[PDB]
Amino acid sequence: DGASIKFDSICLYATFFPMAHNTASTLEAMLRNDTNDQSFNDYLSAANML
Amino acid sequence: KEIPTPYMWSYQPQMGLAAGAAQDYSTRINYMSAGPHMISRVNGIRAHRNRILLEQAAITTTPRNNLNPRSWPAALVYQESPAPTTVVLPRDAQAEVQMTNSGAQLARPSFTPRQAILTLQTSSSEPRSGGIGTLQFIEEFVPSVYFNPFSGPPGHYPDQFIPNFDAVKDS
Amino acid sequence: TFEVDPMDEPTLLYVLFEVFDVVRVHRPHRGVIETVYLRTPFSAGNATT
Amino acid sequence: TAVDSITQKKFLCDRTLWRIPFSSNFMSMGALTDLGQNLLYANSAHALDMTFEVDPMDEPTLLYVLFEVFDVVRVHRPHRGVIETVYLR
Amino acid sequence: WSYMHISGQDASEYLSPGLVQFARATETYFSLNNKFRNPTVAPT
């Protein structure tokens, strides 16, 4: 039945932490570490079949 | 007893520990004895190779004690690089309290220069434990030969040699 | 063998094998993402796509 | 004539064999490649569980897979009558 | 550990130099380099 969705004004948003650069630039360089990095998993730790 | 193959360790990566050793066949040469003038060569070229893989086994790694240990500390297996590089800040820690809340809004620092830096270590928080991480497998268990198959039935045999094997119990 | 209840309509037996998905985000440069994804009861090659 | 459609683009290979080297760069420079039979790639044992995901199979077809192994023979004749046998895989 | 001309060197070096001369002294009558294996190698 005659209906459609189109698009008109698209935007991205980013709410950063308003931090003091003294602690911001130190720990982004400490996350810049070879050992201290980031890892993210899932609750669905599962594969799929068809 | 007389002609065995050099045993080759089978691997499982994410565990870190090798499963067990096995003989080579898909490149093993013809054993249909060519004659009395080449039998000493096919048994002789292999014989010096048996000492090639024997000598390096004591050099590349310390001689076998626990043949396959999962609970493994780091000594020959290398813990990753411990060197940090620390840089300063464009803005100071204590030279900012004077301005913004009072009236003057803010947007080496070319206002009031100061030099203050603090360096902290990059190393793995506590030492490496468990299996081999990246690539230290060849340096840990080099292909080594048991030239007298199962010589000694009830006491001990090639134990951790089996892939269907864990360190806790045999079988 | 899946000897199950006979149903009226064609249904997809969408089985899920619990296989861990880890993505380690190595970030040794400010704004550079270099990652590898791997699973444990799954080799990253042999699969249905 | 105002008839509109998209192209159906593909390719047709037949009389060729898909070759892959074994080097670090992957190039067939001679028989021995840079990571073909190096030192790690000669002493340690490994497995192969590689997929062959493919196109429409209207009839049952045998996917003929080759592996580039080594079979070099040295024909020995130190004697007037006997060929000495050496065969490697 | 490799004997059958697989990690050994070019034909002229290891082999007996008695008829290495005759490999290119006999010009078109016996132009032979496929008769023996020529092993070529790459750095590690």
Curated annotation (Swiss-Prot), chain A:
Protein name: Hexon protein
Location(s), subcellular: Virion; Host nucleus
Subunit structure: Homotrimer. Interacts with the capsid vertex protein; this interaction binds the peripentonal hexons to the neighboring penton base. Interacts with the hexon-linking protein; this interaction tethers the hexons surrounding the penton to those situated in the central plate of the facet. Interacts with the hexon-interlacing protein; this interaction lashes the hexons together. Interacts with host dyneins DYNC1LI1 and DYNC1I2; this interaction might be involved in intracellular microtubule-dependent transport of incoming viral capsid.
Inducing factors: Expressed in the late phase of the viral replicative cycle.
Domain of life: Viruses
Native source organism of the sequence: Human adenovirus C serotype 5 (HAdV-5)
Other observations noted: All late proteins expressed from the major late promoter are produced by alternative splicing and alternative polyadenylation of the same gene giving rise to non-overlapping ORFs. A leader sequence is present in the N-terminus of all these mRNAs and is recognized by the viral shutoff protein to provide expression although conventional translation via ribosome scanning from the cap has been shut off in the host cell.
Family: Belongs to the adenoviridae hexon protein family.
Function, as annotated: Major capsid protein that self-associates to form 240 hexon trimers, each in the shape of a hexagon, building most of the pseudo T=25 capsid. Assembled into trimeric units with the help of the chaperone shutoff protein. Transported by pre-protein VI to the nucleus where it associates with other structural proteins to form an empty capsid. Might be involved, through its interaction with host dyneins, in the intracellular microtubule-dependent transport of incoming viral capsid to the nucleus.
Residues of the full protein shown: 604 to 653 of 952
Swiss-Prot record, chain B:
Post-translational modification: Cleaved by the viral protease during virion maturation. May cause the middle segment to be shed from the capsid.
Residues carrying Phosphothreonine: T62
Top-level lineage group: Viruses
Phosphoserine carried by residues: S123
GO cellular component, one term: viral capsid
Induction (UniProt): Expressed in the late phase of the viral replicative cycle.
Alphabetical UniProt keywords: Capsid protein, Host nucleus, Late protein, Phosphoprotein, Virion
A Gene Ontology molecular function term of the record: hexon binding
Miscellaneous note of the record: All late proteins expressed from the major late promoter are produced by alternative splicing and alternative polyadenylation of the same gene giving rise to non-overlapping ORFs. A leader sequence is present in the N-terminus of all these mRNAs and is recognized by the viral shutoff protein to provide expression although conventional translation via ribosome scanning from the cap has been shut off in the host cell.
HAMAP family listed in its UniProt record: ADV_CAP8 (MF_04049)
Family according to the record: Belongs to the adenoviridae hexon-linking protein family.
Complex and partners: Interacts with the peripentonal hexons as well as the hexons in the facets. Part of a complex composed of the core-capsid bridging protein, the endosome lysis protein VI and the hexon-linking protein VIII; these interactions bridge the virus core to the capsid.
Protein name stated in the entry: Pre-hexon-linking protein VIII
Species of the source: Human adenovirus C serotype 5
Lineage, broadest ranks: Viruses, Varidnaviria, Bamfordvirae, Preplasmiviricota, Tectiliviricetes
Gene of this entry: L4
